[PDB]
Amino acid sequence: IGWRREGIKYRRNELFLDVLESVNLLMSPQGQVLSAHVSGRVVMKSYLSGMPECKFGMNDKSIAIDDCTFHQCVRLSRSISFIPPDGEFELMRYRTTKDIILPFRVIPLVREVGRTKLEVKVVIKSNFKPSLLAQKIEVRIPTPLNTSGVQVICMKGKAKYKASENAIVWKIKRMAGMKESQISAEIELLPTNDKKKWARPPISMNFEVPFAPSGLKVRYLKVFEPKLNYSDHDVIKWVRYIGRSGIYETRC
Amino acid sequence: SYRPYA
């Protein structure tokens, strides 16, 4: 075993699991999902006495994994089984497409006003238990190149027009499950080349949520060391989930 | 932010 030495000792035997997932979406203006997927990895941080035999179990047949590689130390077939390296390492990588929780729904509305103004209202809805908070929320709304100026009103958060980047950027520190928020913007237009139709790019979002969008959920982590005089019940165990946007585009 | 699992 060339990834872990033999005489390791700790007064306090503790591990930490991180389930880290990126969730990706492309949605039509109607509300059809054109494309969606999750990339995820499990990271372990282990301060454990000896050379222990850990067994890792999740709800894996309960949601549906499309494929996944593992670390050297994993012995194949099922629940997963290994003697971990000490400290921090990558236990597995994985992908999932069926049955994804999409944390946010984006509902755009756009109206033209002669050749002089655009009217835009965007509504975000959060879709998860109310006991949980999303944080670090950005909503990016693109503006035409003939844009002369922009007014916004928003009851929650803060929004500036960023002329360099040709976009309105709306930021929110935190927001809870099953809620609704809206922004309005009036976009003042310069006159333009007449047969230039605007190709309306997507509205895109960023966020972080404390659950796995894939549905995945940790069911046991069991530690057994036969030589030494601590059992499973002696180990102090912790889990966290961090689900973050990848590409999350909603077409207007 | 780390939930007891023990």
UniProtKB/Swiss-Prot annotation, chain A:
Result for mutant: residue 238 to A: Abolishes interaction with TTGN1 and EGFR
One GO cellular component term: clathrin-coated pit
Domain MHD, chain residue ranges per copy: 12-251
Superkingdom of origin organism: Eukaryota
Expression sites (tissue/organ): Detected in brain.
A GO term, aspect molecular function: transmembrane transporter binding
Binding site for a 1,2-diacyl-sn-glycero-3-phospho-(1D-myo-inositol-3,4,5-trisphosphate): 158, 162, 171
GO BP annotations, alphabetical order: clathrin-dependent endocytosis; intracellular protein transport; negative regulation of protein localization to plasma membrane; positive regulation of receptor internalization; positive regulation of synaptic vesicle endocytosis; postsynaptic neurotransmitter receptor internalization; protein-containing complex assembly; receptor internalization
Protein name (Swiss-Prot/TrEMBL): AP-2 complex subunit mu
Naturally occurring in which organism (per UniProt): Rattus norvegicus (Rat)
Curated annotation (Swiss-Prot), chain B:
PTM summary: Dual phosphorylation of cytoplasmic PPPSP motifs sequentially by GSK3 and CK1 is required for AXIN1-binding, and subsequent stabilization and activation of beta-catenin via preventing GSK3-mediated phosphorylation of beta-catenin. Phosphorylated, in vitro, by GRK5/6 within and outside the PPPSP motifs. Phosphorylation by GSK3B is induced by RPSO1 binding and inhibited by DKK1. Undergoes gamma-secretase-dependent regulated intramembrane proteolysis (RIP). The extracellular domain is first released by shedding, and then, through the action of gamma-secretase, the intracellular domain (ICD) is released into the cytoplasm where it is free to bind to GSK3B and to activate canonical Wnt signaling.
Tissue: Widely coexpressed with LRP5 during embryogenesis and in adult tissues.
Taxonomic superkingdom: Eukaryota
Subcellular location(s) per record: Cell membrane; Endoplasmic reticulum; Membrane raft
Induction remarks: Decreased levels on WNT3A stimulation.
Free-text note on domains in this protein's UniProt record: The YWTD-EGF-like domains 1 and 2 are required for the interaction with Wnt-frizzled complex. The YWTD-EGF-like domains 3 and 4 are required for the interaction with DKK1.
Designated name of the protein: Low-density lipoprotein receptor-related protein 6
Organism from which the protein derives: Homo sapiens (Human)
Gene giving rise to this polypeptide: LRP6
Portion of the full-length sequence here: 1516 to 1521 of 1613
